[PDB]
From a paper:
MalL is a large α-glucosidase: it hydrolyses terminal non-reducing (1 → 6)-linked α-glucose residues in a two-step reaction, releasing α-glucose. Here we experimentally determine the value for ΔCP‡ from the temperature dependence of the rate in the absence of enzyme denaturation for two quite different enzymes: the small, dimeric ketosteroid isomerase (KSI) and the large, monomeric α-glucosidase MalL.
For MalL, curvature in this plot is very significant, and unrelated to unfolding. MalL samples a larger conformational space than KSI, occupying and regularly switching between a number of structural clusters along the simulation trajectories, related primarily to changes in loops surrounding the active site. Thus, the calculated ΔCP‡ values for MalL converge on a value of −10.0 ± 1.7 kJ mol−1 K−1 (using a window of 70 ns), which is within the error range of the experimentally determined ΔCP‡ value of –11.6 ± 0.4 kJ mol−1 K−1. Analysis of the contributions to these differences show that negative contributions to ΔCP‡ are dispersed throughout the protein and arise from auxiliary domains (MalL) and dimeric units (KSI) not directly involved with the reaction chemistry.
Numbering used by the authors: 3 to 215, 219 to 561
């Protein structure tokens, strides 16, 4: 169970480091930056997908599971990376993307040819309605219908994501066997585990029932299908049980009850899952604009949600801890201050997360406080934006252009995908060429070089949080109790382990706040383990908190 004690660094490789100068981050670039990641202190790297792919969804549309996309390199580069990771005592986790393939995968190129093609049932084909329309009213996560018509065979195929991402038919045992072969191919070559892309979607309701009623709907049927956990238990039996591996499922649609199904060790499924419930607190529940209908940051909602996951998986299963990935904006821009208080704010969110029970995930650039971009809408790359613009602004007019732009400036996935900022030179030192997407305009002030030269950097704060997790067993194995539950500024909680107490107090606001210890804790003596402000005190019975002040103390 080394995965319980791990800290994971997530790499989005096309934006991490470009070794050959074409503006596209590559595998040799990752290799050159492994020493940086090890010095930070992560011991597991999760690579977003580098498999061959036409890049309709930047690698999450896979056309060959057993070869690299040309701009990342060759399998020989991938094998070298695996060796270089292991040489440094680290582990490498790959992205398993098996809810769907590219429509340019050989399986689909065969499948679509005819209803009697041997690969026809590798995907999900349905007749039109009598009037020619789609089999049902299901929507794609990237706007529009979940179905696309094939003129040649007169049937629609299903895609929860883009039209170039047809969903695999997991009802077909041959499909499941192909997936397990891919897993064994890579695990036999040293891959230490898998992050499983939208694993909550692999089981469908084969009736494809309409949602109740907007033309296209995404809801309860898009995840948690009737055979989901049967399939994952099979995957464990056939593959995962045969390897010393780590698994994290990207569990779309997960609540805390579903998380127990996924992560209870006695169920022999996965080690941990990503949920979206803490990421969902700033969208309206059921707007036609989905994620783009933004609500202000609500700390009470964050506290209640994260607390439900800490208590729900306190003594069974295991949590993941994240605020950032390649699908989320920079958290300090989204929910905090990314200007005069950027360093304090970045360290505050880091303290909230890393003081909890679970496996922390650091997204590339989070550890230096990277921020959202001011680039104009036409410089965004993500197909999600182009498609939502068409549906929400042009066709349905449920958002004005101005409000859509404002929402994309807060939540667009490309705020995670601008190049990693290594120094204040050209293109922040990401590339000698022309980057595939613009470098954030603030890179001269925010970059790895200045971070390593500044003892007060966010980077060294993250490095210390990781050191503390390795030093203080209470951080890995202590229980969890929310304090000051209804305080709208202060996120405070207590971990307990073998008579020790860990107190975490974080002001997640720009204004002065007040922490008062619960009365039974007022006479404890504390050693401050970390704070984003200087501390010289052993009593924490009341703390007058400055903007974004974070304190972590251990009882003595
Ligand atoms: O594969 C579809 C979808 N799954 C979730 C991934 O994190 C996201 O980047 C991708 O677009």
């Amino acid at each position: 169970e080394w995965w319980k004690e791990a800290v994971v660094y997530q790499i989005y490789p096309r934006s991490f480091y470009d070794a050959n100068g074409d503006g596209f981050g590559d595998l040799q670039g990752v290799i050159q930056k492994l020493d940086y990641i090890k010095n930070l202190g992560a011991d597991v790297i999760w690579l977003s997908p580098v498999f061959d792919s036409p890049q309709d969804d930047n690698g999450y549309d896979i056309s060959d599971y057993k070869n690299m996309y040309e701009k990342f390199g060759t399998n020989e580069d991938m094998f070298q990376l695996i060796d270089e990771v292991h040489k440094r005592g680290m582990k490498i986790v790959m992205d398993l993307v098996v809810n769907h393939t590219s429509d340019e995968h050989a399986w689909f190129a065969e499948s679509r040819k005819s209803k009697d093609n041997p690969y026809r049932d590798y995907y999900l084909w349905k007749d039109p309605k009598p009037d020619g329309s789609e089999p049902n009213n299901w929507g794609s996560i990237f706007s529009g219908s979940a179905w696309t018509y094939d003129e040649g065979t007169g049937q629609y195929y299903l895609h929860y994501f883009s039209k170039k991402q047809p969903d695999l038919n997991w009802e077909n045992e041959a499909v499941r066997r192909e997936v397990y072969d891919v897993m064994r191919f890579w695990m036999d070559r040293g891959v230490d585990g898998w992050r499983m892309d939208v694993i909550g979607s692999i089981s469908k309701y084969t009736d494809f029932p309409d949602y109740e009623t907007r033309s296209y709907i995404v809801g309860r049927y898009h995840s948690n299908g009737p055979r989901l956990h049967e399939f994952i238990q099979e995957m464990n039996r056939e593959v995962l049980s045969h390897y010393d591996c780590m698994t994290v499922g990207e569990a779309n649609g997960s609540d805390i009850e579903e998380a127990k199904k996924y992560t209870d060790a006695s169920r022999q499924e996965l080690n941990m899952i990503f949920t979206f419930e803490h990421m969902d607190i700033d969208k309206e529940q059921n707007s036609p604009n989905g994620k783009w209908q933004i609500k202000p940051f609500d700390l009470i909602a964050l506290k209640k949600t994260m607390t439900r996951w800490q208590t729900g998986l306190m003594n069974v299963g295991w949590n993941t801890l994240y605020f950032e990935n390649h699908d989320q904006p920079r958290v300090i821009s989204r929910w905090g201050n990314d200007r005069k208080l950027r360093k304090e704010c970045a360290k505050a969110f880091a303290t909230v997360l890393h003081g909890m029970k679970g496996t922390p995930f650091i997204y590339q650039g989070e550890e230096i406080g990277m921020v959202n971009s001011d680039m104009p809408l036409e410089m965004y790359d993500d197909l999600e934006i182009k498609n939502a613009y068409r549906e929400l602004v042009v066709e349905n007019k449920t958002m004005s252009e101005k409000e859509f732009v404002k929402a994309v400036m807060i939540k667009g996935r490309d705020h995670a995908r601008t190049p990693m900022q290594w120094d204040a030179g050209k293109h922040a030192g990401f590339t000698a060429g022309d980057p595939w997407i613009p470098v954030n305009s603030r890179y001269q002030d925010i970059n790895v070089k200045e971070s390593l030269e500044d003892q007060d950097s966010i980077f060294f704060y993250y490095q210390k949080l990781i050191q503390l997790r390795k030093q203080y067993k209470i951080m890995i194995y202590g229980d969890y109790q929310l304090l000051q539950e209804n305080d709208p500024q202060v996120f405070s909680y207590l971990r307990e382990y073998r008579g020790e107490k860990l107190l975490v107090v974080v002001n997640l606001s720009e204004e002065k706040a007040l922490f008062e210890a619960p009365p039974e804790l007022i006479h404890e003596r504390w050693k401050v383990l970390i704070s984003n402000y200087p501390q010289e005190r052993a009593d924490l019975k009341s703390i007058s908190l400055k903007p974004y002040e974070a304190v972590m103390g251990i009882s003595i």
